Structures are given as C-alpha cells and as structure tokens.
RNA sequence: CGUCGUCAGCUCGUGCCGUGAGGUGUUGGGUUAAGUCCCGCAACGAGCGCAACCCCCGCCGUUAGUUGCCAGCGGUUCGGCCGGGCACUCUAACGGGACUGCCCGCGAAAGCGGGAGGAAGGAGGGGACGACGUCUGGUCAGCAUGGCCCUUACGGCCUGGGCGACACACGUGCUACAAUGCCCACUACAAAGCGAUGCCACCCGGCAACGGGGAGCUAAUCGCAAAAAGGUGGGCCCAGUUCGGAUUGGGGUCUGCAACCCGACCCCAUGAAGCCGGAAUCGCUAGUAAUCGCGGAUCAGCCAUGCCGCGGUGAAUACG
C-alpha cells in the first residue's frame, strides 16, 4: 500500500514515501526534474532504487524541507533507502555495502574565535 | 570613571543625543551591555560567580 | 562587482535597496 | 542634458569657486588633498599620485 | 479553552511546574493538551576574557530561555481550584489568556 | 604526515560514465567548489569530443591522462653543499595528480574564449601527443635524464 | 593567567546561583541592580556575623533574600531586635517590599568563603601568613572534607616583593566538572596593600 | 553632494544679532562659535569673526559664498 | 588576562641508595593522542595535570502536540486555506546506543591488523576545560589597592577645536584586474538570531534613499526576510571593455539641537589605478581550505571592508 523512510544530510529532511507504481517521482509537488531542475548530481538520489531494481517498480511522493538542494538529495537519497526496507527488509544485503544506509554526519563546523572561519587562521607578518 | 564624570546620571542632556549608557558598577562606559547595565567585565565577573540569573556559560 | 554600489551586487553587498536593488 | 565641452566648463567653473572663497572644499582642491573627508595618513594615492617616498626612522616598529 | 504559557530559566523548574498544572486541571476541566514544548531562545554574550587588549580571549555565556503551552480546553470552575492558587517553584512566571 | 601514511580519499564515481577518474577530473576543474559548473564543463567538452572526433570521449580523455603521465621527475636534494636535483620514478599515485593537473592547467591556457571547449581541444590534443599538457611531461622526463648523472643519490 | 571561577565553571551542575529569579527585556537589568544594592549593605554590615551567601529568590513584589551565617544570632539581635533594623533598611532600599530569611552555617569550616575571610583576617591582624594558611587547610581539612587548598597573593609579610603562598590536602580536582569544589575568595586591605585570599573546599563528588 | 532637508539651520545666537545689526544697517565685526550654522543672505555683506577653536578669524561673508556653513571658511588644523 | 602549551609533564608521602647536593619512584621493554595502558624493577601508593563526569552535532524510542502533513477522508477563493488527525518533519525533555562488547589473526599483557552487525567506532565529529612554573609579560585607564604628587587648582562646568591631521614606512583587511566572467529578467533550496515606539505586512507619492497611511506581533502562529552562490532565458564578445569602481561635480533622503572641520544612504554625471603582482611571506589535512549570502552584540545615526556567530556549494594533497 505504501512505504516509509525519513532520511537526513548535513542539516535536511526528506520524507520518502514509496508506492508501487509507474516509477515517477514528486518532489514538494514539482516532478523529480523539475524540483532538481539542472543538477548534474540529482540522479544521485535514485541510486538505492537502480540498486535492487526499483524505480520502474515503485513510485515517490516527496517532502523536503532543509538546507540546499544538494543536501536534499542526499537526504530523499538515503529517504528511498530506508523506505526501500520496510517494503523488503531483504534489501539490507545489497543495500547496505553501498552504504546507502548510513547517514553521512559531516557538517558545518563551528566558528570558534580568534580565528577568522573555525580555522582559517589569520596571518601575520614580520613575526 | 571619575565621580565628576558620572553626570551621565544627571538625565538634563539638554539633548537627548548626550545619553550614555556607563556601567552600574564600575563606571566602565567603554563597552556596556545594555540587557546587563554591566560592561563587558563586570559581567564577565559576575556570570562566575552565579549572581547573573540563568546566565550559564554557553558552548556548542 | 560587490563594490559598484549601483548595481544587484553592489546593493547587495551594501544592504541597501534603491534603484538598483528594488523592495520587488 | 548639458554635455561635452560646455559640462567641462561647468565642473571646472564650479571648482574655481568654493576655491576662489576660503572655503575650505576649496583648499582642498588647492592643496590637492582628498576633498570628501577621507583619511590623508594612509590611501589617498588616487588623488596624491605616485608615492614619493622620503628618508625615516627604522628601529621603532613602524610595521 | 484557558491558555496557559510558561517560561523559566531551569528545564526543571518547569517541566515541573507546568506537569503540575496538568496532573491537577486533569480532575475538574477537559483533558488537557499535554505540556507542549516551544523552540528556546538564547541570548548569547560573548566577551574578551581579560580587561586591556588580548583581543582573541574571549569565552562565552548564554541566556536561554525555555518556554510551555499546556492549553486546558473546557475550564470547570474546580479546574480554576486546582490551579488558582496551588503553584511552588520561584524561577518560573507565568502569562496566561484564557 | 609524521604518523600515519595518509590514505588517499577514494572518490564517487562519474554520475554518467561512473569513472572515478573522471570525478577526479572534474574536481580539478572545479573552483570555489562551484562543482556544478565543473561537472558540467567536462561533459559539454565530452560532447564536443563527439562531433569533432567520432571516437567515445570517454575514450579519448583516459587516452590523453596516459600520454600526459610522466613516468620520471626530478626532485632536488641538499648534498654536499648544492642543490643536486635526483632523477627518480613517479608513484602511480602521483603521476595522475600530475597528469590531470597539467591538463586543467594547459587547458586554461588555451585562447578558445569558452572554458568548456579548451578542455575539449586540450583533451583530443594530448590524445594525438601533441599540447601544452603533453609538453610539461616531456620536459619533466627531459630534466630527469638530463641529471641522470646524480641518480646514485636513489632516494 | 589561567583556570576558571570553579563556581561558574560547574553552574550547570554541583552548584546552583545565587539568583534564581525569571525577568527579561525591561526589567531584568533593573531587578539586578537591585540584587546588587541588597548584597552590597549585607556584606557592609553582617560581616561579624559571617557572611556566606545570599540567595535572592522572587515572583512579584515580594522578594526572599535567604542570608547564611556563621553567627545567626549577631544577624537577629537581641530578641529579634537588628532584624527588625535590616529588614527595614531594606525596603527603604525596594519599596518592593521583602522577606529576610536568615540559616545557620553548619560548620563554618566548609564554607570557602567563611575560610578565606578567616585567613583574610589573620592577615590583617599581622600574622604569619604561611602558619594561617596551613592551620587554615588543617582546620578544613580537619572537619570532613575530601580535599582542601588555600592561597594568598603577594607581599607576604609586607615585603617588598611580592610573592605567593600555597598550602593543599586531599584531592582538589579543578578539572573534574563534577566535583563540587566551593571557591572563596577574600581580600585583606592592608598598611601595605591588598592581598587576596583563595580558598578552595572540596566535598563528595557525584 | 551636501544635504540637510527641510529648514535651513543656522543658530540664532548671530542670526538674531545680525539682523538685529540689519536695522541700523550693518556694523564692525561679530564673533560666534556657531560655526555649526549655515549662510543666509543676511549675512552678507557682514564680517563675522569665526573660531579656529582656538581663534576668532575676520570672514567678510559675500554672496558668492551663501549656501556654505561659515566654519568652512576658518580653517581647524595647521599644517606645512 | 596573554604566553611556552592541550605540551605530557610537575610533585608528594613513606621506604630504599648517597657524607652531601640529590637519587630511586617518574627510569627500562611493548603501547598510547597522553606519566595512556601493559610487562619489568627497591620500591609501594598518592596529589596537580591526561582521560572521564558537562555542552553542540550523528541513529532509535517514550512523553507533548495551534510546528507539522490528504500521510488518510470530505470541501476549496485548491494558500495545508476548512473540518479533522497526530502519523511524519519538527519543537524540547527524557530514555536507549559503542565497550575492541562479538568473530578470525599475532601478542606474555596492554594492544595492532582484519571482518560482522550498526547511524556511528576503536578518543565518531566540534566545544567548555590549561599542571608545578616561566616572561621582574600586560593592565594602577574598568574596578580594587600601598606609596608619591595636586588642591583656586595636575580638581569642576561649558562652547569650539583635536583624537579624522601628512612628504612618507609597515601590519590586518575590502574590492579587483574578468568569459569557470559581468549585466538584466524569470525561477528554487538555509540556518541561527533579533523586534515597544520596536520589527515593520499591505496601499499610496517618489527613478530612488525615503515620506504618508496603516494591519498584525507582545513574537514556533505577525515582521525583519530578499538568502546569495544556484537553475532557465537574453545581452556583452576579449576591449581597460556592459571588466573594475577610486576620484570629483550636482541633486537629494535620513538620524540628530546640530552632520564645515567630520555621518550613512539614494539618483545623475564623472570613471582613476588595476591586464594577476620583486625579494620575501601567511593560512588550511574535510565538510576543512576555497567560495556565497544571512544574523547579532555596540547602537540616534555611523565611517562594519572589523568582531562574534549561521547555513549553502564543496576540493587538492600528504612519499616522507
Ligand atoms: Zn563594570
């Protein structure tokens, strides 16, 4: 009937709900394309999909809401991972030595003081 | 910080523009916060000791 | 470039709006 | 629009006045320093020329 | 429908005082929504450390603020007896609007 | 690196042909991790590595990386007083970071107005051994070779 | 020039403040300066008594103020009779109109700031300072305590060039953000100048 | 490019006394430290003494020189 | 408060060695980010420091739902707008999870290598946190304080000027020299913050700064706010140029008693140097550098291209 599985990167949300269908995909209501209009790395998203031969399978509604649209698409990428087990919880073993399943923890790092950008320290002169 | 130099007090700006702020401790008008009445030291001071109401360090 | 104070950028840039950088 | 020439002479007439009276703008022009209040210390090349670089004094950290 | 909004300093000092005013309200009103959250707002000073220059010392102190909802729908008299007059922590103040 | 031997970042492969290399490649392209612009500047260059030239470009690019390899660098060292720079082998490892280097160097070094197209030119270029990245390879090899009179000093 | 104030380092923990009122915006800097006012006059005039602390509590016009001495009788007065004298000095203060609640110090050999003004005084008097010192680390170390530390400025003995003297027992870990470490700290004005007086309590742990 | 608004400031401590000296014509000087205040017509023909900040410079103000500010012709900094 | 230095050290107690200063311990072998741990040993333990206990970010669950969504149903001015619903995102509080715990290999042990599960590891990523001491380090100008000095004044009030001067020298920066670019238009994703005379919706007058009018907000429910880089379409066509904006002339807005000295902003004109920088020299090992915009404190206004902080996109390289 349907499918669920979150999915978050450096700082977005992305709610993926699978269905089995045709193999589109709405993204905040826009098509996949056309949410991603432009973006040599969108494909990217779809990659658990082609990983056990989805997609012209399943089908995708899509709620992203965080960040930027690269990080979305690490967020919907790993979203169509997850979903993509409750379904089959058999997926696992192809899935997961991708590393489809992890949730990359790489974020901004903080400005700490005295320096100009967390490290970018600044420089001097006749020392 | 001198007495005499706390006619800051004295409100009679004569024009409002003369108004500033100066610490309500030590006098130390050169960088007051305004939510304190405290410059940078005193609250600096008194953040340590606890006297400042929900006024932790922060860190993150 | 950020520096032509009459320009997107330049407004920009500045934090400004006026003829060149519209409220819209 | 007053262009050209007759614009030149316009500019250049206004120049010669607030340089004719005291008025300071006006020795500014004179003195050929920068007239909009900018500091004369350091970075006013635009308006000084090249540098004309004089004798000094070394040991006193002028860095 | 009486709306109750509580903030404090201490995350304690609250959800204790605010789980009172449910547990009591919850035997003479509606149900009560629940103590609702709410986003924290933190005031942040960041100070050099030491008085004359060393610009790069620093160290920072915050002031956050937590607030509370609650929202008791259907107010029955008792329900303003359980509440009205039976609070206790002191770092906490209350705003409501029913 | 005083500690461990730093192990190399392993990249995600092209997002159409799948070669990493190709990643590589564009990252080197890239500036201000403006990576979009990147990606896109190989691939309209590997479009014009179609028309003009009816071989895959794919192909033609991993074909260019090879002659553009040096397979011998010389690297200076203090002995006795000078400077003599030791003739020596090139990891495999650092004769791509050369090659695909000197390719986006010799690439922007061209006149073709468009960004896109001197990576093109540049790539088909180097396949045939001839251009400015090309060049570089054979001048190392040439210094190297050319010292090879200090090559007991093996490093 | 290092280490933090061991009391504001552990707020968040094993160490509450010293106000714990809520306030904001427009009056927090007003309802502050007032907290500032009613401690200034305490330590003015309660200091025989053995000033250790000042809670300050509040909720709308009705402030606490909770004094804690060595000495709860020099406080009261006779029959209740001085506080009577303060606790009306103080609404001549705040209007605000306030309580004045007073505890007993148990084992004023625990309160760090009650040992430093112990040695602070001492000091003054022209006593040895490395003996008040030592005595005074025995004497809290002496009556529980896990740990126990006590420093003095310099100008030891007035001379000349000023020094720094010691004196530790017990663990006094400043690192472990958990230990419970009551800092004091107290001057000593003097013929030849000030000298401070750090004292350092450790007790439990978790 | 100078701009104030809307109304022309100039301190009344010499406007008022400059007119003042309008009814009998003009007079022979005037002195003020409201360098601060702007030239209107009259002014002209006056001789208004402004302060460096430290003296009282003779400015015959004419009508060439209206719209400016008076300090603008006693000079603060010496210099060369 | 800075600093060596977040460096892996500095010591004590008792014992033992030495006429003594002192030594042993703290050295040796293995290991570690670490005086970290293991094995050894006339040493046995301990204190300050390391680590841990605290904060932010990674995954899961409970509680809570005016944030949230047809997830799921009916309606629609089809705006999650309406009813409704807490599932989800989220909000903030608490709980779980990682410990070389499990599997194979070497080892005496610590542990090293490898593998499974897992969001994650072998200190998972970033903070707070700085030992005994050193520099006669920095600050009597924040405050405090010994001593010396001044008291019609070395005090106090005021107006004005100065701290903004310049032939020059240096440091830290901003903007840039352009096509991986600049301009115009259209269109899309963020976080953390701040708001009472304060943020300013929307409407009108103005090219505009801004003015007039005026809704909501007491601020997860209103405003600052537009994110910019980006995607799409057009223009420019390699030129000191639709690069670059200094400088100067004019008009004007705004704050403020007041913007000559000496404010910021807008519009017209002007349109400089600069075509990538000598010797020499600085930063950064990953979500880092690089690049893009956003907020805040101070604050009437502002010389912010500074400082503290936020998220977006996102590398190269490390033999040694
Ligand atoms: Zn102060």
């Known amino acids: 009937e349907q499918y669920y599985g979150t999915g978050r990167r450096k700082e977005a949300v992305a709610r993926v709900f699978l269905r089995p269908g045709n193999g589109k995909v709405t993204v905040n209501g826009q098509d996949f394309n056309e949410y991603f209009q432009g973006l040599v790395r969108a494909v990217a998203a779809l990659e658990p999909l082609r990983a056990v031969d989805a997609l012209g399978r399943f089908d995708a509604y899509i709620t992203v809401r965080g960040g930027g649209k690269s990080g979305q698409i690490d967020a919907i990428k790993l979203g169509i991972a997850r979903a993509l087990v409750q379904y089959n919880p058999d997926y696992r073993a192809k899935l997961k030595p991708l590393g489809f399943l992890t949730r990359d923890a790489r974020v901004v790092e903080r400005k700490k003081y005295g320096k100009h950008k967390a490290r970018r320290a600044p420089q001097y002169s006749k020392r | 910080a001198r007495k005499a130099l706390i006619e800051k007090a004295k409100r009679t700006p004569k024009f409002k523009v003369r108004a500033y702020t100066r610490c309500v401790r030590c006098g130390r008008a050169r960088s007051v916060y305004r939510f304190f009445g405290l410059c940078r030291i005193c609250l600096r001071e008194l953040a340590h000791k606890g006297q400042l109401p929900g006024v932790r360090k922060a860190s993150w | 470039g950020k520096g032509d104070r009459r320009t997107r950028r330049g407004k920009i840039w500045r934090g400004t709006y006026g003829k060149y950088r519209p409220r819209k | 629009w007053k262009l050209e020439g007759e614009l030149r002479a316009e500019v250049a007439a206004n120049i010669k006045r607030l340089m004719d009276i005291g008025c300071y703008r006006g020795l500014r022009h004179r003195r050929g320093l920068p007239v909009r209040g900018q500091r004369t210390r350091t970075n006013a090349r635009t308006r000084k020329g090249p540098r004309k670089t004089v004798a000094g004094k070394k040991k006193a950290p002028r860095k | 429908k009486i709306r109750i909004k509580l903030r404090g300093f201490d995350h304690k000092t609250l959800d204790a005082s605010a789980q009172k005013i449910v547990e009591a309200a919850r035997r003479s009103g509606a149900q009560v929504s629940g103590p609702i959250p709410l986003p924290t707002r933190v005031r942040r000073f960041t100070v050099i450390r030491g008085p004359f220059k060393h610009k790069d010392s620093r160290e920072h102190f915050e002031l956050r603020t937590h607030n509370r909802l609650v929202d008791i729908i259907n107010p029955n008299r008792k329900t303003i007896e359980q509440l009205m007059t039976l609070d206790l922590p002191t770092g906490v103040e209350i705003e409501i609007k029913t | 690196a005083r500690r461990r031997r730093a192990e190399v970042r392993q990249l995600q492969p092209d997002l159409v042909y799948g070669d990493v290399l190709v990643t590589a490649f564009i990252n080197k392209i890239m500036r201000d991790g403006k990576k979009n612009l990147a990606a896109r500047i190989f691939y309209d260059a590997c479009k014009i590595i179609q028309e003009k030239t009816g071989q895959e470009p794919l192909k033609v690019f991993k074909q260019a990386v090879e002659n553009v390899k040096p397979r011998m660098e010389v690297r200076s060292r203090r002995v006795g007083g000078a400077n003599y720079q030791v003739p020596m082998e090139v990891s495999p490892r650092r004769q791509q970071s050369l090659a695909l280097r000197w390719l986006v160097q010799a690439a922007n070094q061209r006149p073709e107005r468009r960004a896109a197209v001197r990576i093109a030119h540049e790539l088909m270029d180097a396949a045939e051994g001839k251009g400015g990245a090309v060049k570089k390879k054979e001048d190392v090899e040439r210094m190297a070779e050319a010292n090879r009179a200090y090559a007991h000093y093996r490093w | ?206 | 490019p100078r701009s104030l608004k809307k109304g022309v400031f100039v301190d009344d401590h010499l406007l008022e006394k400059v007119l003042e000296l309008n009814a009998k014509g003009e007079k022979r000087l005037i002195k003020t430290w409201s360098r601060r205040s702007t030239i209107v017509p009259e002014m002209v023909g006056h001789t208004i003494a402004v302060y460096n900040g430290k003296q009282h410079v003779p400015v015959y103000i004419t009508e060439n020189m209206v719209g400016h500010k008076l300090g603008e012709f006693a000079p603060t900094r010496t210099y060369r």
Do not use: C
């Not at chain 7, 430093?116 to 008040?132: G, K, L, N, S």
């Open chain 7, 1 to 206: 020039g290092n280490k933090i104030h061991p009391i504001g380092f552990r707020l968040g923990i094993t160490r509450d403040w010293e106000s714990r009122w809520y306030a904001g915006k427009k009056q927090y800097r007003h309802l502050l300066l007032e907290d500032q006012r009613i401690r200034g006059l305490l330590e003015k005039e309660l200091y025989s008594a053995g000033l250790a602390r000042v809670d300050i509590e509040r909720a709308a016009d009705n402030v606490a103020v909770t004094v804690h001495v060595a000495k709860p009788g020099v406080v009261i007065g006779r029959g209740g009779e001085r506080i009577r004298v303060l606790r009306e000095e103080l609404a001549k203060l705040t209007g605000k109109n306030v309580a004045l609640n007073v505890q007993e110090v148990q084992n004023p050999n625990l309160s760090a700031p009650l040992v430093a003004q112990r040695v602070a005084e001492q000091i003054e008097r022209r006593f040895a300072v490395r003996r008040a010192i030592k005595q005074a680390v025995q004497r809290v170390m002496e009556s529980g305590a896990k740990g126990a530390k006590v420093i003095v400025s310099g100008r030891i003995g007035g001379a000349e060039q000023a020094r720094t003297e010691w004196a530790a027992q017990g663990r006094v870990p400043l690192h472990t953000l958990r230990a419970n470490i009551d800092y004091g700290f107290a001057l000593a004005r003097t013929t030849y100048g000030v000298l401070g007086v750090k004292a350092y309590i450790f007790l439990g742990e978790v």
